């Protein structure tokens, strides 16, 4: 009679952590949902193996519509599970899904499991630099959503970070490359003009994070907008002021201009 | 040839990763690090009996100055594993030391498990929300630092959530308690008087995150400081204006007075 929201980490089966395995394993049911980020190093049919149970896959609508519906009825006589890619609660509504799970007299639980969100320290930059964090949406149609734009501006004013989530429309199987979403930037940069997002603009990507050998790049706009930065899923962080450290581990580690090293005070 | 950093994870012995498990079974030597952080929830022969092999523990003089001595004299010629609590490469000062990995010419990956960065998702805030990190630290003798209290005052002035990651004698196992920085926070208030931490504060408090039952407690300085939320280790955040769905859940799932929806939203 509880439910249980499990993470399944960055990149394969072997990312979720053993309490969280463990836990799964010994669950009733086992529902999940794979809207909110990409696995690009497994498949559903490697994680049911390595838990030793048939999962449930729920669309968007499935759960942000009826989660109440669907997984609810089941935890109130069940140990039910819900398995998300990286971490359950991070750049996801799925925290407000506890609610319902209360308002449904059902316990529940959450199990952690790395998260691009803290993965970022693995490209050199100070995870606690990082501000304010932003989604670059894709354009619906003559909708053109532009927020993330001041958020970079925001941070930057400050020296801080941003990092960027990058959009994905899982059921057409779409993921937003770390180019897609710089070029989206420097056309908003042309509308707004707020010399935020330039060509000399120094970014960095991480593509994915989680595999022995994710790509990590840094470099102007001009020089890495059509670099292939190999399949998705990536992020672009827009970094504020740099410590000579961080400097120095991007030359180092990302290949970035050894430029970057003679920070200017 | 191949040194691995391997995170922990969260609390306790089985926070770590399946892959990091994995890959720490099959390396000739397993070195760890608690200084950086602890693990509450377990103990160095837990996790040694876990793994099912022996682990050096190293000091901070081990790593920050013999790193290169100590350990990747012996990745040369072997598969070695570098266990650090949460997230690898969170910790500010783990990043160097893959360069010292790449000039020893060792090939150096990272295993990553949850991090406190990320986990603080479980109090409901959003994670785009949270701006600049801080860290609290105790006052010695000539040395009183202050900086965390204009981070939180230039982040909840953009509207931003902080997140103070409090002090930590890892070698003699001592945590400042949530408690402890309150009290700081209200001296630093009287000093600085700038109105960013009171009795009206509205703050939430993450204490032994990663375990099944952490307590997730939210509410106002005046009526937490003297409160108990148990065992270690205990975070600090310091909400900025709150979405109605934060603050549902910080009602919800984190006890907090009804107030906060007519006052912090
Ligand atoms: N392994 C990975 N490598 C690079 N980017 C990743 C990634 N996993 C997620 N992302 C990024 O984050 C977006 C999903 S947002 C959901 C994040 C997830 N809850 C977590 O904890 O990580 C993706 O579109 C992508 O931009």
Redesign the interface.
């Known amino acids: 009679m509880v439910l249980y929201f499990i993470?399944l980490?960055?990149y394969?089966?072997?990312?979720?952590?053993?309490?969280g395995?463990?836990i799964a394993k010994k669950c009733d049911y086992v529902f999940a949902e794979f809207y909110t980020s990409l696995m690009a190093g497994t498949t559903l049919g490697r994680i049911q193996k390595?838990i030793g149970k048939e999962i449930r896959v729920l669309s968007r609508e499935d759960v942000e519509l009826n989660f109440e519906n669907i997984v609810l009825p089941l935890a109130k006589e069940n140990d039910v599970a819900f398995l998300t890619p990286g971490?359950?609660?991070?750049?996801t509504?799925h925290?407000?899904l506890?609610?319902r799970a209360?308002?449904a007299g059902v316990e529940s639980?959450?199990?952690?499991?790395?998260?691009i969100?803290?993965?970022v320290?693995?490209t050199?930059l100070?995870?606690?630099?990082?501000?304010?964090?932003?989604?670059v949406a894709y354009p619906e149609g003559n909708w053109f959503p532009t927020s993330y734009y001041d958020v970079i501006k925001?941070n930057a004013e400050?020296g801080?970070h941003t990092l960027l989530?990058l959009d994905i429309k899982a059921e057409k199987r779409m993921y937003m490359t770390a180019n897609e979403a710089m070029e989206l930037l420097l056309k908003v940069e042309d509308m707004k003009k707020g010399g935020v997002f330039t060509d000399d603009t120094l970014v960095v990507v991480l593509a994915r994070?989680?595999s022995?050998?994710p790509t990590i790049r840094a470099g102007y706009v001009k020089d890495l907008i059509r670099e292939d930065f190999g399949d998705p899923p990536h992020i672009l962080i827009v970094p504020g002021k740099l410590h000579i450290?961080e400097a120095?581990?991007l030359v180092?580690?990302a290949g970035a201009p050894r430029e970057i090293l003679r920070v200017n005070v």
């Open positions: 993470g980490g960055l394969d089966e072997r990312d979720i952590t053993m309490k395995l463990e390595l971490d359950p609660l991070v750049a509504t925290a407000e506890r609610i209360k308002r639980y959450v199990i952690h499991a790395p998260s969100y803290s993965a320290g693995i050199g100070h995870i606690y630099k990082f501000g304010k964090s932003a989604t925001e400050r801080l989530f994070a989680g022995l050998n450290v120095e581990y180092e580690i």
